[model samples]
Target: GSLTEDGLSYKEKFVVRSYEVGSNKTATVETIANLLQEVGCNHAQSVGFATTTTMRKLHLIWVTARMHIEIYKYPAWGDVVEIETWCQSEGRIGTRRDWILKDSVTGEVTGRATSKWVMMNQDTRRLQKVSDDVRDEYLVFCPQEPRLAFPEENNRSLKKIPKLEDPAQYSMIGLKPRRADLDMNQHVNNVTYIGWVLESIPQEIVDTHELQVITLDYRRECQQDDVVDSLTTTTSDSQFLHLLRLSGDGQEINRGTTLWRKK
Candidate 1:
């Protein structure tokens, strides 16, 4: 039911509080993502390992490269949700993490996610190899392989998200990152990007459809004061593509694609 001290996984329980639910009376995807991130960090801190803050001291930062999330059911407010997460080595330069969410009362699985992370040199703002010290801290906790297998084709599609042109095809919105958006790293949290992405999508689509799966790729970090432009293109009745860029220089910040199903 749970992992050993040296095991690769960690499990935690959280009640779907009122603030975490949306207008539909169900947990929001962004909120679930925040919980996932929280548990992962907690797991690291619990294992006598480096916290994100400590890593900053070494000038190393973990940044998201890709994410795939799927939801079968959204827990209602007041539901106890169990989240379990594990990590796997993605060679020497990256790590892969996976999560499973369950309805605690019924023990029914509700959602799953897989994400890839790469190390960056904060001072240089460039990708870095996972150094030996870092590996020593994390490799002992990694499983031999990924806990969840993602479809290769789906992974390919996410990496090659087609450019969305034709301004008329998309809805756009302006966003300013506030202090609340900043994480311990002093940059906008990854989940905040998801919120901005959703904001560019029309409310009608959100109300009528449920998000089935989404893939996000982060290119640049957003500071607390940066003004962002979020643009979303509906590829089909059930599919959408998104891009976030700095409003001042038009620098690409992130790109994502979401697939929805009729509710």
Candidate 2:
């Protein structure tokens, strides 16, 4: 009676305790993203030898960004945050990933985000086209049009890029793909990738203003055992430029700008 004519389907639930909160006791982007991968691992179905599980198959291994986030409130420590996410549409280079973040106790949505992601080939280390199976599944959940548009220009608002030799010189740090970072898609999950870049930042910035937005462009795939690095530099008083690299210890895989605002 439970099985649908279309095929056997399932929905998994994931709950992350407030412990995932930041040192400041707020739900951080990295914390939220980490929870996402935890959800995918706990719920999404596997897809054979390739770590590219059903979840990662839709959009993993590539560099992607929020493009848009509508926050209602911030979750605090000890608060149980419930995250329910899924993709509604799939494209050649990107897919529509929708999410609902809520406070479990109040049952009130504290925040929500509509994100876009691209798929990359772990073998070729390049962007790959989404297949019919993946696209069909996306349409099933994403029947409505995405409200956010793909970002074109960098929103840093910086008139001139900082010089490389400057303390703000673009710095790229490499991250080695590890087993724990692989999602159902076998590829390094986007959340983990973002974390790598953030961790590379000088602790000074991290301890400073709050992270406002992370814009990512998946230029290529970060394969297992590959070394990924983060390149960063000040673009503007309110923004910084970061690039995630997977090419050995000094190559770039994804590049984008990040904005920070005073907390």
Candidate 3:
């Protein structure tokens, strides 16, 4: 289902464990997101690009800038799912990765996602360009043609997640990231943002619906010390806008939109 060798535009197989599912017995959005991230890291390692110790000294890391995911069907526990992912250059400062999720037994595609990642200096917490040398190292896996999950829009024009208007419908403040939330890069992990975004969701909706599609625009990183606040506004019965920011300075960390379907 991918181009070139397993190292290039790589594919990986994973069994949906019981722990990855929700009360509905299907894998949660967070579980799927983690699988995609794991496969991406595995792809890098296969090509001798980087994971942890091999390139830890470089002080360079990838941070999610934006993400768009649409899940048609959620896999249940014990389901075998295969994911294919590849990386492409997003100018000099960023990269784009896309994934297609398939059910190994049923042989049907269940989900697709595309995300934007930018290089950052882990120590200085500053954005950096993807130098030619760095590009050359990863370029071998990039395919000649660009494939995207959102067929209607090109890479530059993926659906833009909007900010919630003033006077939010709900707010959850005093949110703090625990030490366990930090990834190897010493920042709050991207997957944690999904939890923060949904923190303020109304209980009624949470009980009746589940996320089917989500788009997030990450504006800043959250360190362990940063106090967070979540704000949510319901735009419709099944659509919501969310924002996460620092509780003190009110600096925006993430802006997102989610589409939910009834359980």
Candidate 4:
């Protein structure tokens, strides 16, 4: 795997390990999130930006604002998957990145993702503009044309998650944030939120359905020892909504939706 001749995207291959698979014997959603994190971080480092040292020196940190993923097929254990990722300018405050996942042997696309990230002042935890120095490094590798083709409306649909008022409408689970779930920022990692979202989903659905698309909106950060409630509502046979909230006060933490197909 290598960068395109134009340096627009970086491609790499990975094999799904037995530990990465769910009960259905397919790679789990959190596995995909981990891969996305790995590739994006690596890409930033490769381009001479977003490195740990650079971020620390600049008092900057990258955080995900929104993520949209579409999985056509879930790779089974031991299956090899190839991933390609790239970034596009998203105004002065944020960057847009996209990824495509394919079966290494068959060359069949299995997944695609579009994400938006913004920089924050690590000390203040306030959103900040991408500095000219950092922006220039990313611009050098970006393509003249964008690869994500979704309509503007569809791309923006995941921006807000409606409130679910009826308790009977969704399944719920309780979780306590663990030490291992904390990242370098001392907060529960975003991938852990994805895991909690799936935890609220019904086991029957998990066993019989393949997640095709998902959108996550992060609202609040979770800290160690915070008790969280994970809730899921089935909007339809194929569509579901999720919310993660503080168990003590019911303060919302994150919201998301997923679309699925029968296995």
- Candidate 1 lDDT by residue in tens digits, 138-190: 77777764455454654532467665564725655568878788877687888
- Model 3 CA deviation exceeding 4 Å by range: 1-7, 51-59, 154-157
Spell out the clash pairs found in candidate 3.
none
Regions of model 2 farther than 4 Å from truth:
1-19, 37-74, 84-86, 90-94, 104-109, 118-138, 144-174, 184-186, 246-249
lDDT of 2 by residue, 1-263 (tens): 11123322223334445666777677777666666555433333431221234646544354463334444566676667776655445457566555567777878877655556666654554666766665654454333654332223653221232223334354554457678888775867677767776765667777777676565565555778787656677767367776665545445466666667666
Checking candidate 1 for backbone clashes, the offending pairs are: none
Q: How many residue pairs clash per model?
A: 0, 19, 0, 0
Clashing pairs in 4: none
Output the number of the lDDT-best candidate: 3
Residue 73's lDDT in candidate 1:
97
Quote model 3's TM-score.
0.89
Ten consecutive residues with minimal summed lDDT in candidate 4? 149-158
lDDT winner, 3 or 4: 3
- Give stretches of model 1 more than 4 Å off: 1-6, 50-58, 149-159
Cα-based RMSD of candidate 2: 6.5
Query: What are the lDDT scores of the predictions, listed in order?
Result: 0.80, 0.56, 0.82, 0.80
Q: What is the lDDT of candidate 4?
A: 0.80
Cα distance off (Å), candidate 3, residue 196: 1.1
